[PDB]
Amino acid sequence: NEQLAKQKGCMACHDLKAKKVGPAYADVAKKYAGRKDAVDYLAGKIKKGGSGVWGSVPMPPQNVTDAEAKQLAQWILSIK
Amino acid sequence: NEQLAKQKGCMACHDLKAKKVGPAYADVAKKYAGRKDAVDYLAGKIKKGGSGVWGSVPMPPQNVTDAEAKQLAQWILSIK
């Protein structure tokens, strides 16, 4: 039960629900940092959408310019 | 950049950081609901700890009785 889980400290490491459908950017950065074409790969996913890397729910194509997608990929790849 | 990501709606589906190291319980429930020995499997992971199912960071053995671990597994498996 929930307050049992709270009392035993479990919620220090677990949440009840993933609020968001997409991966946190820091996890995207971890998965791709140190890989050579990740800015092209990420920019393309942001602009055109994709599914199946993290789960079944897809990301729709996003209304960004090629420049904006590239900058967002670069930003995400800099996450510390 | 961050306010670019905010402005383009991205943060409706993504967070900057996964605050917590462990999977959200609703994702644990999804992964195991409809499987026959999941209460024994989960109770055992809660009590004894484990790693590698969701990632590298391990869950330490947790200070619960066998009864408490079973009840927590059952609770988690009921999550809607």
Ligand code: HEC
């Ligand atoms: C970190 C210091 C933890 C605390 C305290 C608790 N949990 Fe945990 N849990 C943690 C991690 C890093 C993981 C993933 C382990 C892995 O294999 O990658 C888990 C996992 C679970 C699970 C799923 C186990 C599985 O094999 O899928 C459950 C059901 C679970 N955790 C429950 C749970 C409970 C009830 C806790 C308090 C008694 C609890 N955890 C504490 C990290 C940590």
Ligand code: HEC
């Ligand atoms: C839901 C309605 C989304 C919004 C709006 C945006 N994102 Fe998204 N994103 C979403 C999902 C469900 C996923 C996982 C897709 C999968 O393959 O399982 C993603 C993924 C990303 C990624 C990683 C792509 C990869 O192949 O690993 C990035 C870099 C990303 N998303 C960024 C991003 C940006 C910058 C957004 C606003 C312009 C954005 N997403 C919106 C869901 C949704």
